[PDB]
Amino acid sequence: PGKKAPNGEFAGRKLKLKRKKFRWSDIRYKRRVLRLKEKSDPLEGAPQARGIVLEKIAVEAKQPNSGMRKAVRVQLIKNGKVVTAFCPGDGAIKFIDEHDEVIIEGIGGPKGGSMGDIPGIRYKVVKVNRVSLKELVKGRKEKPRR
Amino acid sequence: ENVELKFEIPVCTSCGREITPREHATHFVCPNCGEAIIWRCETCRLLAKPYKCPKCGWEGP
Amino acid sequence: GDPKRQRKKYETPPHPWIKERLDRERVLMDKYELKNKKELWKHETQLKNFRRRARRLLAARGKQAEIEREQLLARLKRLGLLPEDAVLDDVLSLTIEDILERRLQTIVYKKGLARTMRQARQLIVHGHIEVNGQIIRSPSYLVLKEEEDTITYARTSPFANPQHPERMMIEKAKQ
Amino acid sequence: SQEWKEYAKRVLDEWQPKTKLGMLVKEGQITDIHEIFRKGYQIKEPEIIDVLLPEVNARENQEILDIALTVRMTDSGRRVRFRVLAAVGNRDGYVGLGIGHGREVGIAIRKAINYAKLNIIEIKRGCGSWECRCRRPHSVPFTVEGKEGSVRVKLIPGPRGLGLVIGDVGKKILRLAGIQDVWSQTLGETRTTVNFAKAVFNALYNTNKVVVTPEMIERYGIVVGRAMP
Amino acid sequence: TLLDPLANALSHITNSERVGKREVYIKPASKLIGEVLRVMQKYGYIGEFEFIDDGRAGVYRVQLLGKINKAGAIKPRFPVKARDYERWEKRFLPAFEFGILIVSTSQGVMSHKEAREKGIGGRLIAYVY
RNA sequence: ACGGCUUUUCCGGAGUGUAAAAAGCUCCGGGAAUAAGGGCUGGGCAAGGCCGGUGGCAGCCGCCGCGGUAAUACCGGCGGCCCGAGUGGUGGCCACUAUUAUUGGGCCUAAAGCGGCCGUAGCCGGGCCCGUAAGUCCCUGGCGAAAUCCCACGGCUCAACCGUGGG
RNA sequence: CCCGGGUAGUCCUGGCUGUAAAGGAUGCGGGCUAGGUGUCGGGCGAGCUUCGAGCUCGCCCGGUGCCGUAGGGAAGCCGUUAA
RNA sequence: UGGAGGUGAUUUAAAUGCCA
Numbered sequence A: 001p002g003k004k005a006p007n008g009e010f011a012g013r014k015l016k017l018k019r020k021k022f023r024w025s026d027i028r029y030k031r032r033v034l035r036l037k038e039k040s041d042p043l044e045g046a047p048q049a050r051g052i053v054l055e056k057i058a059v060e061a062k063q064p065n066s067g068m069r070k071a072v073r074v075q076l077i078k079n080g081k082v083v084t085a086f087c088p089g090d091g092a093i094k095f096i097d098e099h100d101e102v103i104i105e106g107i108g109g110p111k112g113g114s115m116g117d118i119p120g121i122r123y124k125v126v127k128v129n130r131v132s133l134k135e136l137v138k139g140r141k142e143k144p145r146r
Numbered sequence B: 001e002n003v004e005l006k007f008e009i010p011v012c013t014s015c016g017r018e019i020t021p022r023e024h025a026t027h028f029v030c031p032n033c034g035e036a037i038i039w040r041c042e043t044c045r046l047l048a049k050p051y052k053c054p055k056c057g058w059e060g061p
Numbered sequence C: 001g002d003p004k005r006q007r008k009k010y011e012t013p014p015h016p017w018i019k020e021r022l023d024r025e026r027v028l029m030d031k032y033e034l035k036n037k038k039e040l041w042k043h044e045t046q047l048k049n050f051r052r053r054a055r056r057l058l059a060a061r062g063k064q065a066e067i068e069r070e071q072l073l074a075r076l077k078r079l080g081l082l083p084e085d086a087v088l089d090d091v092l093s094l095t096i097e098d099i100l101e102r103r104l105q106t107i108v109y110k111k112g113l114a115r116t117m118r119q120a121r122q123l124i125v126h127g128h129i130e131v132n133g134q135i136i137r138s139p140s141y142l143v144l145k146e147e148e149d150t151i152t153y154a155r156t157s158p159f160a161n162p163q164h165p166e167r168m169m170i171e172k173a174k175q
Numbered sequence D: 001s002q003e004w005k006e007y008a009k010r011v012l013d014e015w016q017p018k019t020k021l022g023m024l025v026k027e028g029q030i031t032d033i034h035e036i037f038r039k040g041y042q043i044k045e046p047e048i049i050d051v052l053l054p055e056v057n058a059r060e061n062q063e064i065l066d067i068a069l070t071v072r073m074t075d076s077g078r079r080v081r082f083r084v085l086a087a088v089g090n091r092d093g094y095v096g097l098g099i100g101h102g103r104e105v106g107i108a109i110r111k112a113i114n115y116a117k118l119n120i121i122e123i124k125r126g127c128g129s130w131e132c133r134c135r136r137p138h139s140v141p142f143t144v145e146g147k148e149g150s151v152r153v154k155l156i157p158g159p160r161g162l163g164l165v166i167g168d169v170g171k172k173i174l175r176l177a178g179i180q181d182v183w184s185q186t187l188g189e190t191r192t193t194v195n196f197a198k199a200v201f202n203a204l205y206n207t208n209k210v211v212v213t214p215e216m217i218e219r220y221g222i223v224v225g226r227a228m229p
Numbered sequence E: 001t002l003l004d005p006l007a008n009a010l011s012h013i014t015n016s017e018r019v020g021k022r023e024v025y026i027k028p029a030s031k032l033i034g035e036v037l038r039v040m041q042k043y044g045y046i047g048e049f050e051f052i053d054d055g056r057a058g059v060y061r062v063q064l065l066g067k068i069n070k071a072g073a074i075k076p077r078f079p080v081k082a083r084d085y086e087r088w089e090k091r092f093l094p095a096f097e098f099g100i101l102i103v104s105t106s107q108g109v110m111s112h113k114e115a116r117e118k119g120i121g122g123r124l125i126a127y128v129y
Numbered sequence F: 001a002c003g004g005c006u007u008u009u010c011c012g013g014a015g016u017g018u019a020a021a022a023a024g025c026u027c028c029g030g031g032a033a034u035a036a037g038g039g040c041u042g043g044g045c046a047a048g049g050c051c052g053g054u055g056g057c058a059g060c061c062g063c064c065g066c067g068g069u070a071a072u073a074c075c076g077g078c079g080g081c082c083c084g085a086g087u088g089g090u091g092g093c094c095a096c097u098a099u100u101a102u103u104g105g106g107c108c109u110a111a112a113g114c115g116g117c118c119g120u121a122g123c124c125g126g127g128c129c130c131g132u133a134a135g136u137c138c139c140u141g142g143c144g145a146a147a148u149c150c151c152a153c154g155g156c157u158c159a160a161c162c163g164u165g166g167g
Numbered sequence G: 001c002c003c004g005g006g007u008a009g010u011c012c013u014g015g016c017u018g019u020a021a022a023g024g025a026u027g028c029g030g031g032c033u034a035g036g037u038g039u040c041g042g043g044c045g046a047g048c049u050u051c052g053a054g055c056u057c058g059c060c061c062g063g064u065g066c067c068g069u070a071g072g073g074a075a076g077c078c079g080u081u082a083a
Numbered sequence H: 001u002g003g004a005g006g007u008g009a010u011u012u013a014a015a016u017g018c019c020a
């Protein structure tokens, strides 16, 4: 290597070219201009959504742990997509019956992906039948629509 | 504090760049003279560069 | 492009947990009996802006920058935070504590208008003190220089007669 | 500052040297700190400084950065020893820095506190940022730099009052020498507290590696060591 | 190739001091280099120099004082409106005035410690400090 | 625990405000009466070596990480610290990130030199004298709306908010 | 993997293929900044010399090697043939 | 003192390993 590429007075045009090109080899630049987070995002890039449930299943954790966390499958309304919702709160699974409208948020981990031991999920519960779940975690409120 | 130029940075006689608080400079009364004082700064001393008594005419180590 | 917003008037702290910083502001948070932490930072900000003005006018030069600098001393001594003549550089030798004094709460206290700090506050916020012939209800006013001395009780207040026996508690301490 | 003269009569009588500099301080010729350094002596016995800088032992000119344990293996299990990074110096103009080792946290701390008594060196100061045109030693005079390990750093003057602004294991060792307001530009990796310490302290050494001609002395108020007790 | 009668010279001299030398030799000798010597000497930085020519572009003989910490050169060769100086004294210097910053204006070459008084601007060249 | 005192707030009531009103605002008459959540409580990071349940089970976890019958790291309770009419949760953007670098990065072993060689264009180019005034620099006319920023001063009780000046 | 045999290829003439650890794992030009030590070319200077276009010893300019200061790098390490 | 390069040699049958 030597001093630097267009390190002259007039050649600024070449310099803007150099920067305009080598800027692309990034990764946050691309994933924005071409709007790739869009049109691959089961919510179309928004902070919440509503859905209906289909089943009640259970998943296993990462390699050095132990347990079976509970899981539900929501069928969306905005798109007809079918996405995977985990629910916190010990034994909350005592309530979500087949065909209850629920809400869905993120889980806010690395990159927005998953987190912690459950690696395969990306979505968690907040409200059921218009009721904030944290309540039913400690009871403290009763439940409408059965 | 009662600064009367209290204590003065001695300066090399070969190099000319005054002397830092740990450089292994060294002092000795000028030979052949017995009167003048001579220091030699560190790098000034490694690659042996000559000197000369300010009052004698005898020069170089 | 986009309509103008109304800025907040202060600066929260970068990190709120620097242990020895909490346990530095701690004492002043009581030594004057303020209420919420913000009730202080406002004034720190007021200080940092004075200083951010002090430097910049010192590293420029020009017809207006000079007057804009020399129209300052008039203020920052007219308020009273300064000596009579402190040439520009002294403006950097100011503290949180000088500004902290000129609050009406302290001044009405360092003039013996009541027993303690947590009570001069109420004596104001119920409306008994008065500035240059004017009520105020602001435990955070900055009394100027021209008015520290023209201050008494209210011409309609239950205290303004040396017979409100609570007023007659107030002298006993003075000595 | 009484006790830190009582220590002189406590110490000067209770010790006989084993080196030479010991004598030339013990018998009354050299009795002022700032005239032992700029001549290339050797410091091997850690009392000569105490006898002239008797506030180095005050538990406030002393600061303890970190304890960190290190391990090695042998065919009989693990063998483990500690390293603490300790620096000292009076809050006027003089600072020293040492590492030390040992098998227990005490012996380690004491050993290091002693090692960091010898290397101790002195500074210059000033005020020459573009704002503090004052002449009072509240900042490092002129922007200089020092290198170590895989970390460079270059210090910049700044106005009287802007609080210390450098990483959290730099604020101490800057506070000791009392350098109050100074701005920081970092490179490399600031997560080996050691090379951080050594690079900062090296810069403060280098402070006396630039020639300032006669006139400029009365431009930033350069001092040496103590100034106006 | 011989792209620069100057950066050659300044880098060569700021090495010649770094080993501790005493005499030097500038190899190609413009008139502007003799100019820059003039301005660089008047403030007490180098010894007594003279122009020896031997038939081609001459040489230069100068002696030193081992006395200048670092000198370089500014190649992109900016011009400066006469009022943006700090912006270029926060880039090359150890202080607000420690040292100089040469200038090539419309009345010749002259340090900015006088260019700011007469209030002019223009292309820089290099920096001694 | 007792003794004094208060009336911003809260209930009644009048004046005044108003296009009509409502608020506010000066007076009276009442009375400590009418006024507290939220998050945390293993290191990052202020904070419990405190008590009571749970058995690689339920669960926590922004990362590293706990749970094997003796858990400061779950569930509680009891204590405890940070903000304070707000404190929390998921999404975008900038700083931190010299991980997009003219200031100001690198490319022998870690990403990274084209298998080597001619030359097109474009980018950088020796010394000396005489002119040109485009590039440059300075002084100077005409110009780049008001709003928005900053400086004091003045009016609403001071603060916002409005105005005369000055950039 | 060891052994006994054996087709295409290797070989000659006119072609297309354009692939390597194609490795100094180091693009290419210019100026400068210690000293030591061999060796190929040329040349200059002294000596010898079976007088041969030979054999020693200095010094100047070019390629190819090793040891190591100032400085530089995370360190292996480079050091006028720079990293 | 330590290497820094080159030519030769350099050997029957020998597979795999829960749990904290």
Ligand SMILES: [Mg+2]
Pocket: none
């Ligand atoms: Mg608990």
Ligand SMILES: [Mg+2]
Pocket: none
């Ligand atoms: Mg803590």
Ligand SMILES: [Mg+2]
Pocket: F105
């Ligand atoms: Mg990098």
Ligand SMILES: [Mg+2]
Pocket: F126
């Ligand atoms: Mg030319």
Ligand SMILES: [Mg+2]
Pocket: F146
């Ligand atoms: Mg406008």
Ligand SMILES: [Mg+2]
Pocket: none
């Ligand atoms: Mg007013």
Ligand SMILES: [Mg+2]
Pocket: F158
């Ligand atoms: Mg006002």
Ligand SMILES: [Mg+2]
Pocket: none
């Ligand atoms: Mg305003």
Ligand SMILES: [Mg+2]
Pocket: F162
């Ligand atoms: Mg306005």
Ligand SMILES: [Mg+2]
Pocket: H012
């Ligand atoms: Mg075998």
Ligand SMILES: [Zn+2]
Pocket: D126, D127, D128, D132, D133, D134, D135, D136, D137, D138, D139, D160
């Ligand atoms: Zn100063």
